[PDB]
């Protein structure tokens, strides 16, 4: 026996059933370019995550509203959506969960918030800044563009202390150029 055999893992996306549907290709490419995604896989996993959330809501809604499991898990699901900004305090019902869309989840990405908070000039610019260790969520540096920001953490997005854009020393390109100028 190997202990590592008990480590769990799972899949995060499913490919479309119809690979060459022109309407789907047009819609997917628009989201990919709008949010600067790497490929269709990033969009597909968000859809996979959204399907899981909606599926949970549907099962709860099918139960009686007085069912203890409906009350307990229903509140937990609503609380989870609120903490990430997907829902609003005025939408505290499982029915509003079924109304969520892919755009709502893509708007909570670190890449989207960096661009829409003025820190980046373009959505694609935010992608490079995140992966280049220039952004931090609170005290922790985050280099993952897919990081889903929480409402309580959205106001703490700022440049990393070690980055040239957040008080750190200039990068090696400027430092080498300064060295070259000094030698002259």
């Amino acid at each position: 026996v190997h202990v590592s055999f008990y480590r769990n893992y799972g899949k995060t996306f499913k490919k479309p059933r119809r690979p060459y549907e022109k309407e789907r290709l047009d819609a997917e490419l628009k989201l990919v370019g709008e949010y600067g995604l790497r490929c269709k896989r990033e969009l597909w996993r968000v859809q996979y995550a959204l399907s899981r959330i909606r599926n949970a809501a549907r099962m709860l809604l099918t139960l009686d509203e007085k069912d203890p499991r409906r009350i307990f898990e229903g509140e937990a699901l609503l609380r989870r959506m609120n903490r990430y900004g997907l829902l609003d305090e005025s939408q505290n019902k499982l029915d509003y969960v079924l109304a969520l869309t892919v755009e709502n989840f893509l708007e909570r990405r670190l890449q989207t918030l960096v661009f829409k908070t003025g820190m980046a000039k373009s959505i694609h610019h935010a992608r490079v800044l995140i992966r280049q260790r220039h952004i931090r969520v609170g005290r922790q540096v985050v280099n993952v563009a897919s990081f889903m920001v929480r409402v309580d953490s959205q106001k703490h997005i700022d440049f990393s202390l070690t980055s040239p854009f957040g008080g750190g020393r200039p990068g090696r390109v400027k430092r080498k150029n300064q060295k070259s100028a000094a030698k002259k």
Binding site: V1, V3, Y6
Partner: protein, 261 residues
């Protein structure tokens, strides 16, 4: 197999031990002793996983081999010694003394005791019968045998045992109206008042227990352990006091705690 199994795979260990599945391929195999392997807490778990005194399997051996740990008033050096319900664990150097009691979620809790209360324990009588030479004796569910017991003591009763004199100080008859704790099954760790006893000839006897908040639950006679006569237990209970809260109620408390804390 051709004999006795000496290993316990970690995933096969009792769930109430709360052992991480990736911590290793094996779990401590409980040694033979007063309590069953599935209803005990080995000293290695207590010293390392519960109290954090030991950081590794090796360090537990060092602590026990110094004779610094006592169970029911006697020094124990076996790492996998099966300490169980109502057992008293004493550590003179730390001046600590604990009693093994189930929390409301069915897991063993090291309930700190005062010095005065650590001089006795409660035992459930298994049976009473005549021994050799016609001498009556009774045996309990913690492996103890007591000769010349009080004639009024019968099976399923609870006896207060003094760890110093090793004699029965007092006993409680098993009857409806006493406060009992559930020591096994789904309702393990719950405390209530025995309200009814349903006997079925040739089958298990069912007992209905009502909680202090009016919640009523059933269980088998073998999973009941009387704690006191009337409504006051003879031993100190943890904070929950055997009151099982719903997940909704538990979640409500957690939400309030964050607001205050």
């Amino acid at each position: 197999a051709r004999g006795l199994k000496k290993h316990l795979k970690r995933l096969n260990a009792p769930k109430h031990w709360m052992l991480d599945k990736l911590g290793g391929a094996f779990a401590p195999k409980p040694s033979s002793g007063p309590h069953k392997s599935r209803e005990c807490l080995p000293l290695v778990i207590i010293l390392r996983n519960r109290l954090k005194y030991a950081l590794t399997y090796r360090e537990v051996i060092s602590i026990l081999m110094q004779r610094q740990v006592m169970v029911d008033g006697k020094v124990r050096t076996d790492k996998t010694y099966p300490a169980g319900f109502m057992d008293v664990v004493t550590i003179p150097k730390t001046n600590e003394s604990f009693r093994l009691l189930y929390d409301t979620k069915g897991r063993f809790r090291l309930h700190s005791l005062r010095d005065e209360e650590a001089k006795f324990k409660l035992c459930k009588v298994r049976s009473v019968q005549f021994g050799q030479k016609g001498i009556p004796y009774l045996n309990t569910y913690d492996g103890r045998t007591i000769r010349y017991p009080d004639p009024l003591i019968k099976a399923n009763d609870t006896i207060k045992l003094d760890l110093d004199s090793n004699k029965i100080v007092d006993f409680i008859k098993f009857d409806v109206g006493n406060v009992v704790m559930v020591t096994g099954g789904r309702n393990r760790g719950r405390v209530g008042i025995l309200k009814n006893r349903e006997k079925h000839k040739g089958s298990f006897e069912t007992v209905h227990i009502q909680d202090s908040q009016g919640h009523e639950f059933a269980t088998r006679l073998g999973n009941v352990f009387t704690l006191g006569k009337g409504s006051k237990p003879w031993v100190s209970l943890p904070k929950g006091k055997g009151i099982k809260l719903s997940i909704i109620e538990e979640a409500r408390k957690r939400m309030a705690a964050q607001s205050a804390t």
